[PDB]
Design a protein around this nucleic acid. Structure first.
Lengths: 124, 115, 52, 75, 139, 174
RNA sequence: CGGGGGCUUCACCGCCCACCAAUUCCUGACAAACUCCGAAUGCUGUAUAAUGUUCACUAACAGUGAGGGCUUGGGUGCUAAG
RNA sequence: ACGCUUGGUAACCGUGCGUAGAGUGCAAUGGCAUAAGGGAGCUUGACUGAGAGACAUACAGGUCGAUCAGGUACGAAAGUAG
RNA sequence: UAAGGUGGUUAUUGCGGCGGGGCUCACCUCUUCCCAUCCCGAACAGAGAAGUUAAGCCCGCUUGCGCAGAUGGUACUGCAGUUUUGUGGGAGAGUAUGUCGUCGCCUUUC
């Protein structure tokens, strides 16, 4: 399966920017793997269908002015006392990298390495 | 360090820990080997090597290695006493001061090059 | 070697066997002269018994 | 109790730093063991104290597997 | 009771716990757990730990395990009564563990949600911390 | 001058050149040393030194201990060792006489242990010191204990090893 | 890997079975007297920019040497105490 | 770790792996393998007259220390040794 | 171009594996002499050049073990008020990733 995520490229990076971003229900995320790491922001609503689901998805990052990024969820940071998402880190996929992922077994999760288009949804 | 080269590198290290040389009074390194022993005058404070002698030239007569080393020492002494170098600090390069090394040192001491 | 520590009785001696009359001249530290050197008369040499 | 004893401090630490001037006999570092090794124009004493040899500017320049080599640039 | 078999030193100073534990706030090997949502650090003692463990184990008789992601590693002393202030530290009274806001203490893997909520609710009534019931994201 | 050195350099070089897929002459294994040692469980019993400097024609050493394990009351620094080393034509003569006489004189001598190799190419064999060696007279001896002879060679594998030995007088129980 | 325990028997002999269980690998995580790492601040030196004896030295004369509250970092005490 | 009579993987020996887990008389800390740890040869500088300059500093005290002169020990020599 | 000697550079420079080479380097043969083994020409020292790239050594490849390592976020923290916070500094760990070195001086060579 695959999900889509419309983000907004961050124009300022720092502490004041992150504070003003989290004071509006947004989540700063980073995406790396290609030419340079791109920092964007999600509305904290594109998730809850990618993070809290017990399945393996692939995100299609669309910054509007940019293009499809075809990322995979790699890193998540949560708050200790509130369980709120603080930061997400995505890994790009273009055509072939023998990417490594975690796939849930079907009758916890096994690590697999496969081409971007040859990843299984569940192993048996 | 027991491969006949690491053993010599250790000696060279604990000799160079105290032996060095400036433009005046440079260092005299020796290299033995199975044949054709070599010697060289190095300036460790600034890089460039001053001179170098070896038993490969039209000046050495064939014979025993001790006599060859004495001749090489005389040659390097006569070559170094041209520009004005009068003092040297003779190191060993990881070789015991006995035999060809001592012969080279005595051949250099019979000539000038106060050391 | 180092002269003055090792035994100087390390000479050439014969090991003439008794069964097959085989004489082997070796160097060891060991009786009397057999032909031209001391001799050690024994029972079983390298070629005396099976498994050899 | 049985824990009421201690000894006076030896006032160790780092004397003249790596940007200041010293003279022919200025103590540079007081140590317990050669953790700051001597470099150029700097020697070590019996008590592993670093002394200057000539007047100049101190320079630490940690190197060679994280080992301080205090030296003096003459001036 | 849970306590180290031996240790280097007998008496330990009573430090200062600054909250928001940045390590140990995620579920692993279990899908349900209880986490501290207090405002300051606390000392969980071995008696409380054993009481909560046995209370959670009497429920769900033989189904699933009970992972305890904590250990009472530090000794807390107490001088006897009717003694004036100061003749040295007192004898070690008990052993406790530092719990900072966000730390997860108990976990259950086997039982379903309907039983794992009741068991953890029954166990949380023996701890001196405000606890919330957390479930894993991959569930 | 010895027999086995000439025999080696005359036949065994060419023997090991074939049947093993070797190309260079400096690739065939050779015997480096025959160092033989003997332990002493007496923590003035150093007659083993004089015993060992009779069958080799070469002086031995003492090799004071290093570990101070109080189980045996060793008190590290004791004469418990002999450790006489032979790595020359002395070793060639000793190995010659050993393999030709007093090795085939053990009570029910069925050869040697074919699996006594340590995997690196060396061969450690222990003998029980009978009257086998024709250097002692069995008259003024205290029934000295055996030895732990060790042939160190140049061979790299155990398969390549044991061939230089089977090409010599040592029987490997087969 | 091996030791303790049940049956089979001349043979703690050749076996069959369940627990405490060396070494190795994977995870979760503690320490003032642990550190492969490691800040902010503070300290030192040079120059500059603001303020001008506030600095330093000599002589003479003193008093003080029972302190306390509040904020912060700690030890002890029961994360008690004006 | 692998081999070998006593000898037992904890005595000695042989071959590999082993940056330091050993040792440094005696507590702890710091340091040390290009050794401050171990061995062999020769020796007594564990000398005389002394202290450029610093670190601690109520005082009394304390610590490190470079050149020079007179004669020595080792070393082929540099050089080291108060 | 290639090799040998000798230095600077905190392993991105090391360890291992796979192939190639020998005017110089190295094994290699001997112990009368100089020299040495708490036993051994094993090591050191000397006398030689029958053989050899087998090894040491040098080249080319290898992300394998090591070593280095971001951007972003977080912890922590100086100053000001306070339940909140605002201004600056900003880790450690982890991820992507990089690395099979580089810079001089002499002698023989092309």
């Amino acid at each position: 399966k695959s999900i889509t995520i419309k983000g907004s490229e961050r124009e300022s990076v720092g502490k004041v920017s992150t504070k003003a971003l989290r004071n509006a229900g947004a989540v700063p995320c980073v995406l790396y793997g290609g030419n340079q790491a791109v920092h964007f922001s999600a509305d904290a609503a594109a998730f809850k269908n990618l993070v809290y689901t017990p399945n393996a998805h692939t995100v299609v990052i669309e910054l509007g002015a940019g293009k499809s990024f075809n990322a995979i969820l790699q890193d998540i940071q949560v708050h200790p006392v509130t369980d709120k998402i603080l930061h997400i880190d995505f890994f790009q996929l273009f055509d072939d990298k023998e990417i490594t992922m975690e796939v849930p077994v079907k009758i916890r999760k096994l690590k697999v390495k496969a081409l971007p288009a040859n990843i299984p949804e569940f192993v048996e | 360090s027991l491969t006949k080269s690491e053993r010599r590198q250790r000696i060279k290290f604990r000799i160079r820990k105290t032996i060095s040389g400036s433009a005046a009074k440079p260092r005299l390194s020796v290299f033995r080997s199975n044949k054709e022993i070599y010697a060289q005058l190095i300036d460790d404070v600034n890089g460039v090597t001053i001179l170098a002698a070896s038993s490969r030239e039209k000046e050495i007569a064939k014979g025993t290695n001790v006599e060859i080393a004495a001749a090489v020492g005389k040659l390097v002494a006569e070559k170094a006493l041209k520009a004005g170098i009068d003092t040297i600090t003779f190191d060993r390069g990881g070789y015991l001061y006995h035999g060809r090394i001592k012969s080279l040192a005595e051949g250099a001491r019979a000539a000038g090059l106060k050391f | 070697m180092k002269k003055g520590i090792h035994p100087e009785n390390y000479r050439l001696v014969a090991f003439k066997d008794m069964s097959n009359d085989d004489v082997f001249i070796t160097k060891s530290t060991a009786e009397v002269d057999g032909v031209e050197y001391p001799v050690v008369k024994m029972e079983i040499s390298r070629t005396s018994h099976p498994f050899y | 109790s049985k824990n009421g004893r201690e000894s006076e401090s030896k006032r160790l630490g780092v004397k003249i730093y790596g940007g200041q001037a010293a003279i022919a006999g200025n103590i540079i570092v007081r140590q317990r063991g050669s953790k700051h090794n001597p470099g150029e124009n700097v020697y070590i004493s019996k008590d592993h104290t670093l002394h200057a040899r000539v007047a100049g500017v101190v320079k630490f320049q940690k190197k060679r597997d994280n080992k301080s080599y205090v030296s003096i640039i003459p001036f | 009771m849970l306590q180290p078999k031996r240790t280097k030193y007998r008496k330990v100073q009573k430090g200062r716990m600054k909250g928001n534990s940045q390590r140990g706030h995620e579920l692993s090997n279990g899908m349900f757990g209880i986490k501290s949502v207090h405002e300051d650090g606390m000392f969980l003692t071995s008696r409380q730990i054993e009481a909560a463990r046995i209370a959670a184990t009497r429920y769900m008789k033989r189904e699933g395990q009970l992972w305890i992601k904590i250990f009472p590693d530090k000794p807390i002393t107490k001088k006897p009564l009717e003694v004036r202030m100061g003749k040295g530290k007192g004898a070690v009274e008990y052993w406790w563990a530092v719990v900072k806001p966000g730390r997860i203490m108990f976990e259950v893997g086997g039982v379903p949600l309907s039983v794992a909520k009741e068991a953890l609710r029954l166990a949380a009534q023996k701890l001196p911390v405000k606890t919330k019931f957390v479930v894993a994201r991959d569930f | 001058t010895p027999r086995l050195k000439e025999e080696y350099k005359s036949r065994v070089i060419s023997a090991l050149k074939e049947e093993f897929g070797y190309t260079n002459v400096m690739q065939v294994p050779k015997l480096e040393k025959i160092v033989l040692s003997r332990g002493v469980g007496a923590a003035l019993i150093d007659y083993a030194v004089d015993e060992l400097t009779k069958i080799t024609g070469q002086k031995a050493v003492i090799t004071k201990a290093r570990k101070s394990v109080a189980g045996f009351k060793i008190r590290q620094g004791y004469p418990i060792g002999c450790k006489v080393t032979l790595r020359g034509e002395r070793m060639w003569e000793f190995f010659e006489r050993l393999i030709t006489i007093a090795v085939p004189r053990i009570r029910d001598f069925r050869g040697l242990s074919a699996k006594s190799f340590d995997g690196r190419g060396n061969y450690s064999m222990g003998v029980r010191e009978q009257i086998i060696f024709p250097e002692i007279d069995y008259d003024k001896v205290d029934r000295v204990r055996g030895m732990d002879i060790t042939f160190v060679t140049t061979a790299k594998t155990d398969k390549e090893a044991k061939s230089l030995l089977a090409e010599l007088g040592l029987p490997f129980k087969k």
